[PDB]
């Protein structure tokens, strides 16, 4: 059977939104397109700085962006320069004054986007997928998670017939709405096609 999106089913109960503003029917489409372009540019530019979340807010007549990362040195730059460049270009794209802020990820071993990115990079570098998955599960469980699951699908190892594999540890109760479950996905491009990766992480009930 098909399952429902873990984050979407939980928005408004235990999960927040990634965008916050109020608009009438004349501005919704334009604001959405502007946000799409902003996020696209940022993801292209900071591809090597371990980014995991971009939060966009719009006060009266300005734009405010918050970036969550695990390598602030690269983003900030020496004596605050790269952030200035990014502010300039973001203002150019958005069309109004802009402000940029940075935030820290203490432990990239408990973040669902970063684990998926790491697995995808190793798969592109031709590591064995069983090792790639076991390492992630073990580190996550060592650093204090209450449960994790990892799934990988598509022409594994070069085989002619595709497959799907997964591993689990701990608790992952997807039917309980008061549970803090983090979820994200990523793709890998190899000489034989695409490979998909999914990660579930559990941190307790609220």
């Amino acid at each position: 059977g098909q399952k429902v999106h873990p984050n979407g089913i939980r928005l408004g109960i235990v999960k927040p939104w990634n965008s916050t503003w109020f608009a009438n029917t004349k501005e919704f489409a334009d604001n959405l397109d502007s946000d799409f372009k902003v996020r696209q540019y940022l993801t292209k530019e900071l591809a090597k700085a371990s980014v995991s979340r971009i939060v966009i807010e719009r006060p009266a007549k300005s734009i405010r962006v918050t970036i969550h990362t695990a390598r602030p040195g690269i983003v900030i730059g020496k004596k605050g320069e790269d952030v200035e460049k990014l502010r300039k270009v973001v203002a150019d794209i958005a069309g109004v004054p802009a402000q940029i802020n940075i935030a820290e990820v203490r432990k990239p071993e408990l973040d669902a986007k970063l684990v998926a990115d790491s697995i995808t990079s190793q798969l592109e570098r031709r590591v064995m997928f069983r090792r790639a998955m076991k390492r992630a599960v073990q580190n996550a469980m060592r650093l204090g998670a209450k449960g994790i699951k990892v799934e990988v699908s598509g022409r594994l190892g070069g085989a002619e017939i595709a497959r799907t594999e997964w591993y689990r540890e701990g608790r992952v109760p997807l039917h309980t709405l008061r549970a803090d479950i983090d979820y994200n996905t990523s793709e890998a491009h190899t000489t034989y096609g695409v490979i998909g990766v999914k990660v579930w992480i559990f941190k307790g009930e609220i």
């Binding site: 916050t20 503003w21 719009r58 405010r64």
Partner: protein, 50 residues
Amino acid sequence: ISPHVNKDARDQYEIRTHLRLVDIVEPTEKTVDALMRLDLAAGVDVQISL
């Protein structure tokens, strides 16, 4: 929710808009200055009529 053909598979969404009204009758000179000087959060929309 399907890309091609299935017609009985659907999702339903809604957006809610909440509304509030305040009125002040006998003001002073400084109150209007403060009210026009104030600042609010990102997701709130405010309109003032004289």
